[PDB]
Symmetry: C2
Subunit: 170 residues, 2 copies
């Protein structure tokens, strides 16, 4: 069957995604907060579920384990405008099948939900390492002040760790 649960507090985004999925033949329900997500996930069987992390006042990450318990057969994808390695690690531990940064289109969201999608994506990443172009001197200073710690340096510079690393790469 093709029942899809979209969990995101942004109802406009959620509606656009729902309409795109419906045009592809999915039957879509939306939840805009943790109460609604648990109500829905306790009432109907879903084959696919998307989960926003910054769920208004609620933690989307905190929903993943309870969702897996309610929906053991569902494929579950974190779909987030706040992407980070740290949340991706914890989301997978909690039971998420995959994790995608916004913006993503409907085709890529469906792709990311399929069996083995993560393994393909990991290989593609290893084949395509990223490098990014006075700023250099400022980052070398903050990095040295943080005992050569990119995580601490990332937080101080208000940039992603991945961005720091790509900029530091030869």
């Amino acid at each position: 069957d093709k029942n899809f649960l979209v969990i995101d507090d942004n109802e406009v985004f959620a509606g656009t995604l729902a309409r795109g999925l419906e045009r592809r033949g999915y039957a879509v329900r939306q939840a805009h907060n943790k109460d609604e997500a648990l109500k829905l996930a306790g009432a109907e069987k879903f084959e696919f579920i998307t989960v926003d992390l910054h769920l208004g006042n609620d933690s989307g990450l905190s929903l993943i384990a309870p969702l897996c318990d309610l929906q053991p057969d569902a494929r579950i994808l974190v779909l987030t405008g706040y992407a980070s390695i740290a949340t991706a690690v914890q989301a997978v531990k909690d039971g998420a099948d995959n994790y995608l940064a916004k913006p993503a289109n409907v085709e890529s969201i469906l792709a990311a939900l399929q069996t083995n999608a993560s393994e393909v994506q990991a290989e593609e990443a290893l084949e395509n390492p990223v490098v990014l172009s006075l700023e250099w001197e400022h980052i070398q200073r903050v990095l040295a002040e943080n005992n050569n710690n990119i995580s601490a340096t990332a937080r101080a510079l208000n940039m992603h760790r991945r961005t720091l690393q790509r900029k530091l790469a030869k």
Copy 2:
């Protein structure tokens, strides 16, 4: 006990890490390729293991499951100069306990190996969203040419998805 296995093909980096761990009382073995890693992990019990992804001619990612089978009690950390969400997702599925971008110092490597470290790091990330500063017009063009897909856009621009997202953020 405090037996530590460092798996990295860069023997200079591996030696510097080993010496820093030894000064903290760990007994360290190094493996520089997949053959050595499996030989060591089949011969002695380790409490901690670090795994490089781009392991010379070898896949570090491919080592994680066999290492968990040989070393069910070990804490296992991916430590990589090629960080990506996609490899972090797959590494955790394979059994890694955590994942850190290089450069990291010895204190942060040890921190990342402790129980519950990932959950703390995920919370810290959600509290500290990142935003980054004509380039805008070029990224809006590639994004539109890729059907609003940040993953495809990231690969085309040769930048990290996280970097794109932070630069797109309001």
